Amino acid sequence: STQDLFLPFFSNVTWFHDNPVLPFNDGVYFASTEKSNIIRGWIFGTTLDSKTQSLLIVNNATNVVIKVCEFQFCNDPFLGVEFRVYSSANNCTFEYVSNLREFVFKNIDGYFKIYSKHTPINLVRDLPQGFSALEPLVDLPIGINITRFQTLLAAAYYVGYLQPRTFLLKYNENGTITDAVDCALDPLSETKCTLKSFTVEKGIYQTSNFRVQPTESIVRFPNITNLCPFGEVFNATRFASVYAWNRKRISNCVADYSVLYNSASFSTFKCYGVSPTKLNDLCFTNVYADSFVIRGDEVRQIAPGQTGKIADYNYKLPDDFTGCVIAW
Amino acid sequence: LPVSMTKTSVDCTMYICGDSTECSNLLLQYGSFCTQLNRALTGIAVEQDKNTQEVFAQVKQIYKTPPIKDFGGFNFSQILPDPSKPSKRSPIEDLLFNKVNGLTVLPPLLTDEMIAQYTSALLAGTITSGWTFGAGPALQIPFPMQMAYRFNGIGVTQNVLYENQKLIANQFNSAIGKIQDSLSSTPSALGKLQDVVNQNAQALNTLVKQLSSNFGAISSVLNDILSRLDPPEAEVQIDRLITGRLQSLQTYVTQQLIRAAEIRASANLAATKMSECVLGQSKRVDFCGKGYHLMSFPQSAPHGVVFLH
Amino acid sequence: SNFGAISSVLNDILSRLDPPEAEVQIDRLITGRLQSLQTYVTQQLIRAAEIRASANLAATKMSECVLGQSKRVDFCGKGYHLMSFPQSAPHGVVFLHVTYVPAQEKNFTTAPAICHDGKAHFPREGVFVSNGTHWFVTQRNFYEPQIITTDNTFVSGNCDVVIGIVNNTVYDPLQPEL
Amino acid sequence: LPVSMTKTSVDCTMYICGDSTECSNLLLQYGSFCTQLNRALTGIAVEQ
Amino acid sequence: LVKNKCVNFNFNGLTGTGVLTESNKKFLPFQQFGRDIADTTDAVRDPQTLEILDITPCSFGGVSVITPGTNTSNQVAVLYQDVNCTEVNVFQTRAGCLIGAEHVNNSYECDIPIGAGICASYQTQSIIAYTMSLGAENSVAYSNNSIAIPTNFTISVTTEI
Amino acid sequence: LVKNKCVNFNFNGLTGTGVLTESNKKFLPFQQFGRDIADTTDAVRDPQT
Ligand SMILES: *[C@@H]1O[C@H](CO)[C@@H](O)[C@H](O)[C@H]1NC(C)=O
Ligand SMILES: *[C@@H]1O[C@H](CO)[C@@H](O)[C@H](O)[C@H]1NC(C)=O
Ligand SMILES: *[C@@H]1O[C@H](CO)[C@@H](O)[C@H](O)[C@H]1NC(C)=O
Ligand SMILES: *[C@@H]1O[C@H](CO)[C@@H](O)[C@H](O)[C@H]1NC(C)=O
Ligand SMILES: *[C@@H]1O[C@H](CO)[C@@H](O)[C@H](O)[C@H]1NC(C)=O
Ligand SMILES: *[C@@H]1O[C@H](CO)[C@@H](O)[C@H](O)[C@H]1NC(C)=O
Ligand SMILES: *[C@@H]1O[C@H](CO)[C@@H](O)[C@H](O)[C@H]1NC(C)=O
Ligand SMILES: *[C@@H]1O[C@H](CO)[C@@H](O)[C@H](O)[C@H]1NC(C)=O
């Protein structure tokens, strides 16, 4: 059993028959059901606008070629039943030369693993209800951020998208894969994975754990009482002289600094060492407040490192004071 | 004898980690203990319901006693189930029932009434068939003779029984009642069972009580530990907390196993006992009751069994 | 699993970590692995003791249902026991329990004694049975009806106590000859 | 046949902490471990 | 406030996951919150509307897949371990919420164990479930005079292993 | 290449010790090395032959 990237069973795949740009969800699945071979190309990259690295491929009858350049992508590129899917080939980064054909792509760990498997054309109007495996063809070491892809022809096919699931793979008697099971498809199937067995005997089997997740948070609190008496510090009618600065100890009460945020009456609202937003939500021993009047130009002096007369001879703060200050 | 025990079951994580992915993410690094731990309890769980079947499903096909209970003069009305009780139980065992956050508790596979119901049939075949049903197609033999054979099984010629049938009868009926109050009288009668449940409760309550210690870490509520401490430093704190919490659980499990096996040892003993003493008449003196043995009478009980030799 | 260590390999952690700092890192694998080992032991030991208990059973059982004929019902498997046959299997033994089981019966009516000469009778080893007309007494685990004689039964007490003892004849081998 | 092993008893703490109040006061952080340990030993002894 | 839902909470001192409800407990008035015998938060008084709230953890359990042998059918049933189905056809049982199962009244011998005497089997055509049979009943005709003596017999052999 | 002897090896990156014998096994052309069902390296293909 391995958990890796795959197309989950019984996915619901897009069918074409006019080849627009299609993105790359997490992996690239593609397989063309036609003996006409007209569809013989792919485009890779993120911008796809000649400004970013990209990858190109042409599946000739006998001349297979792979390219990594910044082609001037023809916005409507094609060929004829005339191979010019682009307008210029500049700043090339890499080059290589090499009835139902399936091609799985992944740009993984900076590498580009491309996997193939050819099966006959025995279907009429449906993607066959059969099973087989994909055999690796080429792993390419190209460091490209790829978001979308587009197929290049001169029919019909199917394209889905790889997914991060977990599988069990019955390796055969000689190193091939004859069958596999999705872990996460259905109850029955999920049994096989945990039992790590390909065929379950009759009975009962614990598989996983059924737990209910918390759908929401919640918190409640007593009706918030005893607001700290702040109006008589800010809205207070009269103030003392600076050397007669009053210290108002703040006792056990609740602060609610929310007002000093949303009230620009004061001009500074300046806090030191603590952000304004992260102090209306804290707890401390107690609080001491200095309400007084200084000069209109004594605004800067109320800080550590200020050492004026107001600082030194009238009102001093420690060099490491933890609090705030407002002058208006 | 005890027969089963509370099918406890605790998950790996929801014990160690109360759904705190941080705690879980650290836990996964201890490998696969809990699965091993969890599997152990799982087997303990399965072994339990296995015990009861091994001790009660000794009869493939159920029996019923007849409507008219004419037994040569034997009043088993104390032990046969009574219709009057809505639990279809019997007076004796009726006394017996009267006399007795991260985890889970599984119910027993067998419902207690079926537990009684096997005992129900078990009596009938013992009562109205003799040992024969234990070996195959049950055969009905009028009960007085069934005594005679058992008397014949004790080097006691058949003559004595019918000679003294009434006195033989009245003694047995008289004996029966003395059990009923004897269980009622002795407060330490069923201690054997009474201890077991009392022990397991002491185990689990021990297990949870451990959940509130600090184990060389700052505190025992990991969420506050998650809050009050930054993760990387808290991990070391958590690690200590994980350790003690973990192997504390480890102790619980090892504690459980050995007890369970002891029960199993007791269990089979009962099953052996309920084969040899019940389904037939033994000769292992002082195994099916003190003195030469006659028969038995199983009787269902919480988590356990009671025999009447 | 590295038990919370930096790395899961003792060789790399010696290099990829400084040696004095390695020790504390080393300790974790020790404590981790050691306990992990130890739990395996206890896991084994308990299971071993479990086996030994089982072993003794068979050990007895063979020396019970093979070297003899254990009368213990159900000890040699279902039914009255005849013989057991050991066969060796990997790590364990299988026991063919050749047991005996009655199959088919009929209704019969019983009387727990017989009074013939005003005198009681008890079957020495059988039980009195009725095909409706002629009474019979037979071994108690296979219908093998047999004729009433003095030799096949015995006598104790008279006919005033036994419940349901039934008026009937009893034969004497001697009288027809003499 | 053996019949009974030597009735053995070991204190919670006297073993771990040979009478050092600084020790046990650090131990009581460990929940009810030891008290359980005595029980099993005591359980063994009475069993014996 | 939230009731009756798997919610993450804190009442002024104590965290915890749970599903709350208005209990009928009457604490003593000075007290806020209640705790169970095993030292666990079992109740809190909502300090706004001073109701007594019962804490119950989010209902959960294991899951085991009902199945006949894959050999038989791919159609299965699922057991969710003891949650009220409304908390998840469906046939509730004392052993849990057992989806993909149709109960049947007719007594049937147990085939697969679930709990509380609940066993199942394939039928005709899906998976059923039922309170299990007590075993097949077989009454016997006792009398004070009816004796049953066997006439033929078989020497079985079984393999205790 | 050295066979039938206790040696150390590294085949295109496959590190490890042991002894090398001509395995009767059959790989697939693209593959490089087999593994034990219990996840232990079991065989390799010599790039030489
Ligand atoms: C595929 O998608 C269509 C529409 O999105 C939906 O009707 C159909 O049921 C899907 N098939 C499956 C197998 O889910
Ligand atoms: C077994 O190996 C042979 C070649 O040795 C190959 O042809 C055959 O396909 C293998 N078996 C399977 C089931 O793939
Ligand atoms: C809290 O406020 C609510 C608002 O309606 C009120 O009904 C309740 O009585 C108050 N309780 C306290 C303790 O303040
Ligand atoms: C004996 O007679 C009773 C009553 O008629 C009947 O129920 C029972 O089946 C009979 N036994 C046999 C073996 O036929
Ligand atoms: C058996 O019981 C019936 C019930 O009426 C009774 O008539 C009969 O006498 C009893 N048997 C004997 C031997 O007395
Ligand atoms: C299991 O499958 C096999 C086919 O290989 C079949 O012969 C057998 O009857 C099946 N048994 C059950 C119980 O489904
Ligand atoms: C499940 O929900 C129903 C809804 O009416 C309720 O009556 C029942 O009591 C619930 N189950 C339990 C075990 O309480
Ligand atoms: C069983 O019978 C009861 C009584 O009518 C009924 O309520 C219940 O739905 C029945 N169930 C089935 C499966 O027939």
Residue numbers in the entry:
A (entry chain A): 50 to 66, 80 to 143, 156 to 172, 188 to 243, 263 to 436
B (entry chain B): 727 to 826, 856 to 1064
C (entry chain A): 968 to 1145
D (entry chain C): 727 to 774
E (entry chain A): 533 to 620, 641 to 676, 690 to 726
F (entry chain C): 533 to 581
Wording from the paper:
Many efforts to develop therapies against severe acute respiratory syndrome coronavirus 2 (SARS-CoV-2) are focused on the interaction between the spike protein, which decorates the surface of the virus, and its host receptor, human angiotensin-converting enzyme 2 (hACE2). Linsky et al. describe a de novo design strategy that allowed them to engineer decoy proteins that bind to the spike protein by replicating the hACE2 interface. To address these challenges, we have developed a computational protein design strategy that enables the rapid and accurate design of hyperstable de novo protein “decoys” that replicate the protein receptor interface to which a virus binds to infect a cell.
CTC-445 is a 160–amino acid protein comprising 18 of the natural amino acids; it does not contain cysteine or tryptophan residues. The computationally derived model of CTC-445.2 closely matched the cryo-EM–determined structure [Cα root mean square deviation (RMSD) = 1.1 Å], with minor differences observed in the N-terminal EE3 and H2 helix. We used site saturation mutagenesis (SSM) to explore the effect of single–amino acid substitutions in CTC-445.2 on its binding to the SARS-CoV-2 RBD. The experiment showed that mutations in the core of the design are disallowed, and mutations in surface or exposed residues are generally tolerated. The SSM experiment also revealed that there is room to further improve the affinity of the protein by introducing mutations in the binding interface, although doing so would break the hACE2 structural mirroring of the de novo decoy. We also performed an SSM experiment for the SARS-CoV-2 RBD binding interface to compare the effect of single–amino acid substitution on binding to hACE2 or CTC-445.2. Therefore, viral mutational escape might still be possible if multiple (decoy-binding–weakening) RBD mutations are combined.
